[PDB]
Ligand binder design. Structure first.
Ligand SMILES: [O][B]1([O])O[C]([C][N]S(=O)(=O)N2[C][C][C][C]2)C2=[C][C]=[C][C]=C21
Ligand SMILES: [Cl-]
Ligand SMILES: [Cl-]
Ligand SMILES: [Cl-]
Ligand code: NA
Ligand SMILES: [Zn+2]
Ligand SMILES: [Zn+2]
Ligand SMILES: [Zn+2]
Length: 231
């Protein structure tokens, strides 16, 4: 029942409950002449919510906050953006205006500034070196090394064994890489192996775009990234 790109109008947001207190959010956006779905995460944090990633733009992120209030009814108090691209930080200003404390690593904040993207307010400490992990409310944040971007973080939810890979992990339906202008293609397989070694118990793996699956999504992503390298 996970919603697909054809099932979400651009401008609307859907939520999918993965486990007790854990949801993904799904939005869509027009880019380069196609329409893409995009995922983020919502994790219950006591009587508050932690948001992982915007819904890819101001309009979608306003719709995200509305759908969260409608369907969950707890306040989003903190948000973490997992890298500097617009599907992760586009909408940070909407979050900020709604009273959400927005966070990213120092590397993400700097890259967003260089790129011209919205800049989360707070800086996460302890994520500057490959293999670093820190606990941030009900999730563990992990920097696996450069992959889809040099700053990409992944997010693990220990209570539910949910691994949110963000854009470093591809859905199975995606068999080609795409625009890897900001990617470190050469390091990406090693960074995926580091995720595999640090979170081998993950039961549910959420890619940045598209359908969730199991840990197979990690090997799939390596296969796709290597195939692109060889073109
Ligand atoms: O997913 B991103 O974080 O990564 C980059 C490059 N990905 S892309 O191949 O251009 N693409 C495929 C999925 C949607 C865009 C990006 C650019 C613009 C908006 C968002 C993103
Ligand atoms: Cl704040
Ligand atoms: Cl704060
Ligand atoms: Cl992508
Ligand atoms: Na990519
Ligand atoms: Zn990206
Ligand atoms: Zn603050
Ligand atoms: Zn993305």
């Amino acid at each position: 029942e996970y919603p697909t790109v054809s099932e979400i109008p651009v401008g609307e947001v859907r939520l999918y409950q993965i486990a007790d207190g854990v949801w993904s959010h799904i939005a869509t956006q027009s880019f380069d002449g196609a329409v893409y779905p995009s995922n983020g995460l919502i994790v219950r944090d006591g009587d508050e919510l932690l948001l992982i990633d915007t819904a890819w733009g101001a309009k979608n992120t306003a719709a995200l906050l509305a759908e969260i209030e409608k369907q969950i009814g707890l306040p989003v108090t903190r948000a973490v953006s997992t890298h500097f691209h617009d599907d992760r930080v586009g909408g940070v200003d909407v979050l900020r205006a709604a009273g959400v404390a927005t966070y990213a690593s120092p590397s993400t904040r700097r890259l967003a500034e260089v790129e011209g993207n919205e800049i989360p307010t707070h800086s996460l400490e302890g994520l500057s070196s490959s293999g670093d992990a820190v606990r941030f409310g009900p999730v563990e944040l992990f920097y696996p090394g450069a992959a889809h971007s040099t700053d990409n973080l992944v997010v693990y939810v220990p209570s539910a064994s949910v691994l949110y890979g963000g854009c470093a992990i591809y859905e199975l339906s995606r068999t080609s890489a795409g625009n890897v202008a900001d990617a470190d293609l050469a390091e990406w397989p090693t960074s995926i192996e580091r995720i595999q070694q640090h979170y081998p118990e993950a039961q549910f793996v959420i890619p940045g775009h598209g359908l969730p699956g199991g840990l197979d999504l990690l090997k799939h992503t390596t296969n796709v990234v290597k195939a692109h390298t060889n073109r």
